[PDB]
Design an enzyme around this catalytic site. Structure first.
Site, PDB file in Angstrom:
ATOM      1  N   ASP A  35       0.770  -1.567   0.054  1.00  0.00           N
ATOM      2  CA  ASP A  35      -0.234  -0.059  -0.111  1.00  0.00           C
ATOM      3  C   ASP A  35       0.591   1.526  -0.066  1.00  0.00           C
ATOM      4  O   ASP A  35       1.488   1.875   0.716  1.00  0.00           O
ATOM      5  CB  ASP A  35      -0.677   0.064   1.266  1.00  0.00           C
ATOM      6  CG  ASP A  35      -1.783   0.682   1.079  1.00  0.00           C
ATOM      7  OD1 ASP A  35      -1.602   1.871   0.531  1.00  0.00           O
ATOM      8  OD2 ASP A  35      -2.012   1.527   2.120  1.00  0.00           O
ATOM      9  N   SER A 199      -0.634  15.541 -12.083  1.00  0.00           N
ATOM     10  CA  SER A 199      -0.408  15.261 -13.498  1.00  0.00           C
ATOM     11  C   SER A 199      -1.400  16.410 -14.528  1.00  0.00           C
ATOM     12  O   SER A 199      -1.493  17.405 -13.706  1.00  0.00           O
ATOM     13  CB  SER A 199      -2.371  13.996 -13.342  1.00  0.00           C
ATOM     14  OG  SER A 199      -3.005  13.939 -14.425  1.00  0.00           O
TER      15      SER A 199
END
Length: 330
Positions: A35, A199
């Site tokens: 994770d 992004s």
């Protein structure tokens, strides 16, 4: 040194991925959910409340000659999906795909929440976010990667998650045969303890690319792709019959639909998530309504590039002095 381990979807929907991890002496192998959005290595154990164990493999520290109770140390974690666990702490030898760390903090669960109990395939988590998020008190502990980093050939790990297929986590090297083209690296902020990046935009299907900054985290422990409501609305508008369902808890769509791809930007590079990756199947057994793999982050406080996005790429988690993230198509 290096390590390399295969990671395998837990079910037919790729709801999560498990990776075998050796703990203790002699080795006890548990299947952990790696994770990158958390920083605790915790396991089901011989100490876990009996009624809360249902099919998981447990760690039994009393059977490990290298296990040492970390005196006075406890841990307690609550995840973004509402699940939680807590317990005490041992140090022991931990190996992943041939890479060994001695004195790793192994957090033994005394209590786990219902979602963990109900998932027999996940024996615990191995956190790969920054150690500043580790919950051990009163002395915070280091992640497996932080402990291994100095010994690694290169201070990196990579995630290469498969779509309905196994994939690979590598530590200490970049497998140049595992991706196509080049790896595009992008800046990371560690201020929130995550692999947080920005992004450069998105496209839906064959549509035009929209240049827009989307700050979010690369999180292997989250199944879906959580993005701003505007972006998510634009995606689902391209699917006939798709709707946001308050009762179900997100966008659903007719199972008969063919889903468009979703592209996200990494610098000038583009990662394309095929439409099939966005199908999470019937909302309930036998239903013809299916759950979407792209959902709104509006009620989360952060955008999350979870497995839906990451499995479309070869992803480099670069733990150099100034960390960065790399993405390649594959």
């Amino acid at each position: 040194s290096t390590g390399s381990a295969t990671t395998t979807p837990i079910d037919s929907l790729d709801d999560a991925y498990i990776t075998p991890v050796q703990i203790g002496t002699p080795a006890q192998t548990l299947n952990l959910d790696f994770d990158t959005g958390s920083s605790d290595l915790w396991v089901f154990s011989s100490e876990t409340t009996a009624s809360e164990v249902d099919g998981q493999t447990i760690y039994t520290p009393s059977k490990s000659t290298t296990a040492k109770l970390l005196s006075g140390a406890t841990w307690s974690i609550s995840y973004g999906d509402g699940s939680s666990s807590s317990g005490d702490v041992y140090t022991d030898t931990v190996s992943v795909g041939g890479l060994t760390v001695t004195g790793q903090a192994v957090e033994s669960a005394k209590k786990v929440s219902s979602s963990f109990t109900e998932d027999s395939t996940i024996d615990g988590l191995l956190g790969l976010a920054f150690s500043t998020l580790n919950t051990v008190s009163p002395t915070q502990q280091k992640t497996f990667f932080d402990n291994a980093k100095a010994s690694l050939d290169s201070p990196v790990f990579t995630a290469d998650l498969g779509y309905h297929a196994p994939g690979t986590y590598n530590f200490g090297f970049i497998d140049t045969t595992a991706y196509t083209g080049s790896i595009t690296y992008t800046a990371v902020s560690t201020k929130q303890g995550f692999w947080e990046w920005t992004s450069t935009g998105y496209a839906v299907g064959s549509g035009t690319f929209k240049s827009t900054s989307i700050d979010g985290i690369a999180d292997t422990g989250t199944t879906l792709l959580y993005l701003p409501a505007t972006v998510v609305s634009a995606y689902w508008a391209q699917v006939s019959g798709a709707k946001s369902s308050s009762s179900v808890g997100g966008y659903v769509f007719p199972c008969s639909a063919t889903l468009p791809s979703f592209t996200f930007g990494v610098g000038s590079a583009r990662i394309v998530i095929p439409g099939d990756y966005i199908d999470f199947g019937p909302i309930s057994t036998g239903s013809s309504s299916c759950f979407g793999g792209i959902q709104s982050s509006a009620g989360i406080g952060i955008n999350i590039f979870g497995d839906v996005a990451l499995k479309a790429a070869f992803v480099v988690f670069n733990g150099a002095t100034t960390p960065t993230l790399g993405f390649a198509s594959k």
